[PDB]
Amino acid sequence: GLMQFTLPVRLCKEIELFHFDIGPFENMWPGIFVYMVHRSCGTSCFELEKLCRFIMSVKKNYRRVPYHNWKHAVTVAHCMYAILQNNHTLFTDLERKGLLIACLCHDLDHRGFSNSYLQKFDHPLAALYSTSTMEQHHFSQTVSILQLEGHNIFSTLSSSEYEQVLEIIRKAIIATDLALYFGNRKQLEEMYQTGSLNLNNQSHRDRVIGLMMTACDLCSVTKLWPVTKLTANDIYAEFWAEGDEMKKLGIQPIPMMDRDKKDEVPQGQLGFYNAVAIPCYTTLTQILPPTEPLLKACRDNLSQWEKVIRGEE
Ligand SMILES: Cn1ncc(C(=O)N2CCOCC2)c1C(=O)Nc1cc2nc(-c3ccccc3)nn2cn1
Ligand SMILES: [Mg+2]
Ligand SMILES: [Zn+2]
């Protein structure tokens, strides 16, 4: 009860910033997550022993793929931690609990392939879930882990608080399906511009939490340039493995996934910052002004990708 997690001074300070990198020491990531739950939520949100057991079952159910791995889970949760801490009074007690957990869990048992590849390969998961295929799988793995003995970190919630939190987590994990992001942000755009956005409207909250999820999920583009650049290598390592597998099914992959079109990467990064990232963090900054450093950091990394194209690196 009187047992805080604490971090070394450089981490204690830098973890509060949006651009924090959780570092290469895997064995510290659990402690970092618990630190964030404790400051974001309270030392009383979760029975420490249940939390620690839940975190380690989550780690065990992430695979050793280049990008969609246990480091991604904690990175995405840290971005959420930063949004929640800079927007203290906008979120309920249940939202704070459920969203860090949602982010830790959002890519559970990912294999490093897209929903399209599952559908072209005819994976069983693609018959069980016709849209948002991996994301319905991730929520389903979260429920599984929550129902292992000693793993129910929400035990102390009421029957209806319990259902409201599992419903927040579900919507939060579905929203990480980038196919849903485009419409979700268009609507958030119109609602904010016509002045109809209303955070007491539960369907409005849902959309705003969905946009936060997309922001946290993409937060590689909001890091210091060397983090951004070295993360992009892990991303393409998956994309190109997927492209190889497409070719094995006798399908020309999209260029994003063709290792034979490495030369086009800098321009594809621009497409991505302009079509997805920048619009994402813009609308997020409009709705939640203290998240502006994500937008500023994204625009800086766009400008570093422009330099790469110009041969200035
Ligand atoms: C940087 N970042 N962060 C997250 C993600 C991301 O898409 N997520 C969703 C999928 O799951 C993985 C993560 C990315 C990223 O890089 N997206 C990305 C890279 C890219 N390259 C090209 C490209 C097109 C033609 C020729 C050569 C390259 N198009 N293109 C479009 N998007
Ligand atoms: Mg995902
Ligand atoms: Zn993800």
Side-chain angles (χ1 to χ4, degrees):
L2 296 177
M3 266 193 224
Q4 288 312 183
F5 276 63
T6 55
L7 296 176
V9 170
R10 189 194 61 86
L11 281 82
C12 163
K13 298 184 188 179
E14 278 201 34
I15 199 174
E16 296 308 321
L17 312 187
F18 286 101
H19 59 272
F20 187 58
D21 175 83
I22 61 170
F25 298 106
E26 292 209 354
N27 288 166
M28 285 179 83
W29 297 337
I32 285 159
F33 181 75
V34 163
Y35 183 81
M36 291 190 290
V37 160
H38 278 183
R39 290 192 92 257
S40 226
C41 197
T43 61
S44 36
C45 275
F46 299 118
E47 216 251 270
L48 198 29
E49 198 201 270
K50 295 199 147 231
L51 182 59
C52 278
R53 199 156 33 234
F54 176 83
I55 291 174
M56 298 304 308
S57 289
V58 180
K59 175 195 169 78
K60 183 213 296 159
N61 283 288
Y62 275 90
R63 302 182 171 230
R64 293 197 186 96
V65 290
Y67 178 65
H68 284 104
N69 61 36
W70 173 236
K71 198 181 194 170
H72 176 65
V74 178
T75 289
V76 165
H78 157 273
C79 188
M80 179 65 68
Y81 166 77
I83 294 166
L84 288 172
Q85 288 302 245
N86 279 284
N87 300 283
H88 179 64
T89 68
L90 281 93
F91 301 94
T92 64
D93 304 44
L94 275 179
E95 288 176 339
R96 280 201 256 81
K97 283 178 200 209
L99 286 178
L100 293 177
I101 293 292
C103 284
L104 193 72
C105 286
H106 83 280
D107 270 331
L108 260 171
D109 184 46
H110 205 292
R111 332 295 176 98
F113 299 109
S114 66
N115 285 340
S116 305
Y117 177 74
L118 281 232
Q119 288 149 28
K120 262 137 205 172
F121 179 85
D122 200 4
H123 194 278
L125 285 179
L128 179 50
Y129 315 124
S130 24
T131 69
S132 300
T133 303
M134 290 297 319
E135 293 80 16
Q136 301 195 64
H137 184 56
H138 305 318
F139 175 64
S140 170
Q141 295 278 284
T142 307
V143 171
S144 291
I145 290 180
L146 264 179
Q147 289 173 160
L148 270 13
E149 264 204 347
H151 287 51
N152 208 282
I153 59 175
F154 296 125
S155 62
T156 74
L157 272 46
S158 82
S159 180
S160 67
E161 287 186 299
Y162 183 93
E163 167 151 29
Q164 283 179 66
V165 86
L166 258 290
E167 193 66 340
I168 288 165
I169 286 160
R170 185 189 53 88
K171 288 177 205 157
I173 290 185
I174 299 329
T176 63
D177 178 1
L178 210 63
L180 298 176
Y181 149 68
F182 295 104
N184 173 52
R185 193 207 60 100
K186 276 155 205 159
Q187 285 284 168
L188 278 171
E189 210 47 34
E190 295 157 18
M191 289 176 190
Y192 162 82
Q193 282 178 9
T194 80
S196 38
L197 192 51
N198 175 17
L199 299 182
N200 297 324
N201 182 341
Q202 190 58 70
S203 61
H204 284 188
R205 278 186 102 63
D206 290 357
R207 296 202 165 271
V208 165
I209 292 154
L211 185 71
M212 285 163 60
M213 292 298 300
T214 309
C216 293
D217 197 23
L218 298 183
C219 76
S220 125
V221 302
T222 74
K223 301 310 181 183
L224 271 219
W225 167 241
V227 180
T228 299
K229 185 186 162 190
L230 294 162
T231 303
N233 292 336
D234 295 335
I235 297 183
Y236 282 105
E238 299 198 355
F239 286 176
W240 296 333
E242 181 166 324
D244 289 353
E245 290 299 324
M246 285 292 192
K247 287 179 192 167
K248 292 187 189 175
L249 293 174
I251 307 174
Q252 251 304 122
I254 64 190
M256 197 181 306
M257 291 192 171
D258 191 349
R259 58 176 81 257
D260 296 338
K261 292 180 184 156
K262 295 199 187 197
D263 33 288
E264 295 181 32
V265 158
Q267 193 66 35
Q269 286 295 309
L270 291 192
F272 182 73
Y273 278 68
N274 288 315
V276 193
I278 300 269
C280 171
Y281 294 114
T282 303
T283 304
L284 185 67
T285 302
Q286 290 172 176
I287 303 169
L288 300 174
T291 72
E292 195 192 346
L294 296 169
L295 177 47
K296 172 188 176 313
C298 187
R299 275 196 193 281
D300 286 340
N301 281 320
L302 163 52
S303 147
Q304 290 296 290
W305 284 111
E306 286 166 337
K307 276 171 179 126
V308 170
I309 285 178
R310 300 197 300 257
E312 305 165 44
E313 37 175 33

